[PDB]
Ligand SMILES: *[B]([O])([O])[C][N]C(=O)C1=C([C])ON=C1C1=C(Cl)[C]=[C][C]=[C]1
């Protein structure tokens with residue numbers, strides 16, 4: 094790669110790996126639309142397997158960006174509408190607190206306090222209907238944002254119902270396949286297990302465990318090459334040939350709600366560029382990102398703004414990922430690590446790299 | 452042209468011309484995306500000037516569809532947001548009743564009762580500010596739709612403020628030119644006067660007079676050729692090269708409000724296809740089309756629905772126009788006449804024709 098990119102990436106990431114004791118890491122920088130790859134360390138410490146451009150990492154909540162785009166594609170196909178009540182697709186949800194809660198509320202964490210995590214005790218489908226029927230909102234719909242797997246996860250599950258396809262089949266057929274993300278999976282096949290890195294938590298090798306709505310909220314695994322292609326696709330959606338997918342990508346970057354200086358899209362979160370670094374850096378800390386915050390509706394939603402810092406952090410017990418891009422500059426970055434290290438450190442590193450590149 | 456198209460157009464339009472005593476008329480049917488033209492009678496009766504494919508007709512309110520698309524293009528360019536207060540682009544509009552009225556309300560006639568017409572005596576820029584500063588609402592914003600030139604006309608004037616271009620300059624350079632609408636004008640130049648048809652009202656040859664916000668609300672003049680291109684462009688916006696225009700067309704067909712079986716877009720009005728003809732035919736009668744109707748917000752707006760009947764009626768003192776198309780069927784029709792005849796007869800004719808072809 095150009096020495097400028099190589100230098101900026103190595104001067105930032107080497108110290109990060111050292112300070113955070115990250116076992117393995119892969120980074121892609123998209124510059125002027127082209128990708129440049131970097132790797133360090135181990136995918137599997139015990140077996141001394143290095144991180145490569147083919148290593149699979151758990152994306153954790155960056156999976157929500159795929160769920161948002163798949164949902165956007167379903168809207169573009171005319172299968173669902175964000176203004177539709179949740180009950181239109183789950184008639185069994187008859188409890189009165191659901192009146193007024195739409196797919197938009199589920200997609201954007203504004204239903205009224207759905208929990209961050211689905212209880213471990215909820216496994217069966219009956220268990221899931223019961224959990225949502227019994228859930229009591231703390232707030233009226235569309236008034237407060239509380240980041241939650243149980244909210245966008247339910248959106249993903251309902252958004253694909255009209256298609257008749259399973260969520261995995263829909264994601265594969267409508268998102269992964271068209272974008273040539275051939276090494277991106279909801280369930281890692283045996284053929285690819287050799288490339289699946291282990292995550293590390295307190296020194297122990299771990300992989301994400303099955304959980305309700307896992308595919309929809311945090312279950313995608315991908316390589317640094319496929320994630321670079323994912324960034325390129327979201328940076329320039331008009332180059333995508335499949336009409337509804339192009340539209341779905343744009344819908345996921347529309348601004349539906351505002352809290353502080355952040356805007357909520359479908360999966361993606363956005364801020365106006367130039368951004369104030371302390372803003373996105375401090376704002377990524379879970380002390381802020383996972384807190385209940387009042388939101389102002391953007392009526393109607395603002396279509397995807399090119400001059401935006403669009404991003405998403407992700408984590409599982411053993412992994413930490415971050416994606417950020419600026420459409421207007423055809424610039425972006427993907428950082429995949431097999432340790433869940435602090436969000437601020439991720440964003441600080443990304444900012445230093447992207448800011449130096451323009 | 453297919454014998455099929457020739458047959459239904461002849462059988463439907465000629466009796467219409469006789470029944471309504473229409474001096475001159477031009478019709479274009481877009482079938483499978485290709486245009487087929489028909490012309491009858493006189494553009495200028497006294498001079499016995501035949502209506503031709505180069506004849507310019509006053510579009511009347513069909514002009515609102517160009518205003519809607521131009522606004523859509525400005526939103527796509529990030530110059531304006533429909534969620535922004537009207538006062539953001541007209542700082543001088545300080546009267547308390549404007550608090551809460553947004554560009555969306557103006558573009559969709561939901562500001563709360565802005566009048567059908569700007570009083571004839573309002574002419575100057577000072578007159579215009581005075582008019583809006585003194586206007587008192589009939590209803591709160593976003594509750595009732597009352598079709599109005601003073602509403603979308605103001606949206607048009609404000610939508611182009613950020614660009615710094617005049618309304619005409621913005622319309623010409625951002626919409627007419629990219630679409631190669633080479634014979635469409637807000638102000639007809641000398642070289643085209645010979646093609647500008649006379650409108651006829653109670654036997655007298657008439658042209659629309661200057662009026663406040665005329666360009667923005669009802670001042671476009673065009674030929675059946677450019678109008679066929681206008682329908683093709685709205686039928687298939689993805690074929691448009693200019694990214695923001697492509698997006699603007701799509702935004703103008705988004706569904707922002709619903710009243711009965713009709714959805715309000717930016718300029719365009721839409722209904723799901725298949726449509727109930729009684730509904731669009733009787734609904735076009737001014738008794739109804741100009742009456743206040745309660746609206747339900749579509750939160751968020753539904754992106755352009757391909758299986759829709761998209762349309763707009765238009766009239767000036769001496770002209771009557773109609774445009775309708777169905778994206779999913781690549782089918783559309785434009786009917787331009789130099790007599791303002793009953794809207795229901797226009798919609799009835801258009802329905803008979805399009806229903807016969809698909
Ligand atoms: B996403 O990565 O923000 C959601 N993360 C999870 O659901 C998750 C899992 C499956 O394991 N740990 C997490 C986690 C949570 Cl719930 C909050 C913050 C970091 C990681």
Ligand SMILES: *[B]([O])([O])[C][N]C(=O)C1=C([C])ON=C1C1=C(Cl)[C]=[C][C]=[C]1
Pocket residue numbers: 510511512513567568600659668669737764765766767768791
């Ligand atoms: B549009 O055609 O609906 C708005 N029409 C006008 O403003 C207009 C003009 C310039 O002259 N007559 C009309 C008219 C009106 Cl206000 C209502 C219904 C038919 C024609």
